[PDB]
Enzyme design. Structure first.
Site, PDB file in Angstrom:
ATOM      1  CB  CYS A 224      50.062  43.340  76.759  1.00  0.00           C
ATOM      2  SG  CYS A 224      50.963  42.214  77.784  1.00  0.00           S
TER       3      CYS A 224
ATOM      4  CG  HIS B 154      49.944  38.282  73.644  1.00  0.00           C
ATOM      5  ND1 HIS B 154      51.041  39.078  73.872  1.00  0.00           N
ATOM      6  CD2 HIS B 154      49.042  38.603  74.599  1.00  0.00           C
ATOM      7  CE1 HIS B 154      50.808  39.866  74.913  1.00  0.00           C
ATOM      8  NE2 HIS B 154      49.599  39.595  75.375  1.00  0.00           N
TER       9      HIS B 154
ATOM     10  N   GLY C 257      46.058  43.110  81.334  1.00  0.00           N
ATOM     11  CA  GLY C 257      45.502  44.159  80.511  1.00  0.00           C
ATOM     12  C   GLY C 257      46.461  45.266  80.149  1.00  0.00           C
TER      13      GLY C 257
END
Ligand SMILES: *[C@H](O)[C@H](C[C@@H]1CCNC1=O)NC(=O)[C@H](CC(C)C)NC(=O)OCc1ccccc1
Ligand SMILES: *[C@H](O)[C@H](C[C@@H]1CCNC1=O)NC(=O)[C@H](CC(C)C)NC(=O)OCc1ccccc1
Lengths: 303, 303
Positions: free
Chosen positions: A145, A41, A143
């Site tokens: 991920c 993503h 932030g």
């Protein structure tokens, strides 16, 4: 002596974390040999995250849309592919700090260490247990991920988790390093619910042994019980049933303390029915299921 | 019209099956490019299968202990490694019949086709659904291990299953192609129990739509219900709760038949409470949950 929730030393993993940017979306990547792994993503904008078509999104990108930074050094992306929910970016430089590593998928009840990172920079390290409903109880902000979970065996880093999302209940979900989710989740920003969680019984028993080894003995009694009689009480309190394999796994702890596993089950049975009456075990007023038998052996075998 | 449980054509997979022998143990392998994938218990004798130490077992073997046959042609093994529960044998010849392929891990409720094989030779093909307890209801005899499960998307074969074992209840368990088990099982010949199985509700609804499209309409009524009211009835009968995402997935079928999803739930609610009273649906006297909404669309959209 003493007993603490502890993580593995993170040095070998810290050298593998990079920052990955695509558009205005920045998250973390894992740089091993000449590949950077990150959540797919990263290719989404905000309008995309509600119902992304990742295959369409990816074909509209080229290598130069991906900004990869290893500290100050910029890495040149020369190829990209999608593998389930992870993106694999081929870069022109092999990471010289690549440890011996493998990709493993863990089972509910197992533990691992999380290296939380922001902007490619390690921030903190803590231990998690994979819950029976395939979530983890982490601490993650925007932030984070691409932060990874891992265990250390010998000299080898076993990567088992990459972080993707937070569920409405405040728990966390992600994939293995092949991009396959733990649990029935998808990487879409829609409301998803985890299944009912249960208590990991073999872990609770391991922790009661840790307590005895450290001098907390007040909950013991002379009673014993059978597996069947215990499991019938356990399922009323949402505890996982106990198998003979679990009894075998507890062997070293039963030997060290001289307290048979079925004896400890009788003590647990009593704590479930009566509660703890304002008493504590290893500094907790609740029954803890976050430690595996192997975690306990590692801190208690020397006592 | 008509509605049948059907498997994907197996041609692309048949060309990838080989026979793997080590000692007196023979099973099947999957030959893609220059690698043969097979269950790691091929390195066991009979005394080993009760409690194998696979790392010890593997170090005592060399490349020439592995006999790989592609029909008549003998393949020369020039390297071997263990990846979780699968063995990866490097051979000297790339399979010229290698299709476009990927390794995917499926979720409970999804379907796939099994190519049952013995001695490297395809024997039969059938469709399975991954149960909520991570078992499949297959048909497997001695020598079937290494048979694979797959789906076909476009021109690409997605491998999702490799067969390893039968549980005491007669159901079957295995791994993905990275060697990670579906479910909490281990490749040891010890008694292991699967969790409680539940009925896959979205699949049952998809199958009721298939019935309507094919002229079986007797179970419909004018009632409607809400998700919450349905899910409270469903959990009494061991049915998976229905989510809004499930309702969305059924969209094409609700549109084609003009019967709203919540209307169909009211019909299902009645069948659960009253039974079927000696009537049948699509030739079955039980509610079938083995077909996904996508399986149904594939056979029914042309009607
Ligand atoms: C990736 O850094 C980020 C991690 C989230 C942010 C809050 N805590 C986390 O663990 N992931 C997402 O924002 C994710 C992206 C989708 C395309 C999967 N969506 C997500 O977790 O949405 C729920 C949520 C977002 C923001 C705050 C709290 C929950
Ligand atoms: C591999 O070909 C074989 C497949 C079994 C044989 C009967 N049906 C199957 O699916 N697997 C094993 O024999 C397996 C090996 C262990 C090391 C994992 N053990 C197994 O399934 O034991 C249970 C069992 C054996 C024989 C007949 C019925 C059940």
């Amino acid at each position: 002596s003493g007993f603490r929730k502890m993580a593995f030393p993170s040095g070998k993993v810290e050298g593998c974390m990079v920052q990955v940017t695509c558009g205005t979306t920045t998250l973390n990547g894992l740089w091993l040999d000449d590949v950077v792994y990150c959540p797919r993503h990263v290719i989404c904008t905000s309008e995309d995250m509600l119902n992304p078509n990742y295959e369409d999104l990816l074909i509209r990108k080229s290598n130069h849309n991906f900004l990869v930074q290893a500290g100050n050094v910029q890495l040149r992306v020369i190829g990209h592919s999608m593998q389930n929910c992870v993106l694999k970016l081929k870069v022109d430089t092999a990471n010289p700090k690549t440890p011996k590593y493998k990709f493993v998928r863990i089972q509910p009840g197992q533990t691992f260490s999380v290296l939380a990172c922001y902007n490619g920079s390690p921030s903190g390290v803590y231990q998690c247990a994979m819950r029976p409903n395939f979530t983890i109880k982490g601490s993650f902000l925007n932030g984070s991920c691409g932060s990874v979970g891992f265990n250390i065996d010998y000299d080898c880093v076993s990567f088992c988790y990459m972080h993707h999302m937070e569920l409405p209940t405040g728990v966390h979900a992600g994939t293995d390093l092949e991009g396959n989710f733990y649990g029935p989740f998808v990487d879409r920003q829609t409301a998803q619910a985890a299944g009912t969680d249960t208590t990991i019984t073999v872990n609770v028993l391991a922790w009661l042994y840790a307590a005895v080894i450290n001098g907390d003995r007040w909950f013991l009694n002379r009673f014993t019980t059978t597996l069947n009689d215990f499991n019938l009480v356990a399922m009323k309190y949402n505890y996982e049933p106990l198998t003979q394999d679990h009894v075998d796994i507890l062997g070293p702890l039963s030997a060290q303390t001289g307290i048979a596993v079925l004896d400890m089950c009788a003590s647990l049975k009593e704590l479930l029915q009566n509660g703890m009456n304002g008493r504590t075990i290893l500094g907790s007023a609740l029954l803890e299921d976050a430690f595996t038998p192997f975690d306990v052996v590692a801190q208690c075998s020397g006592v």
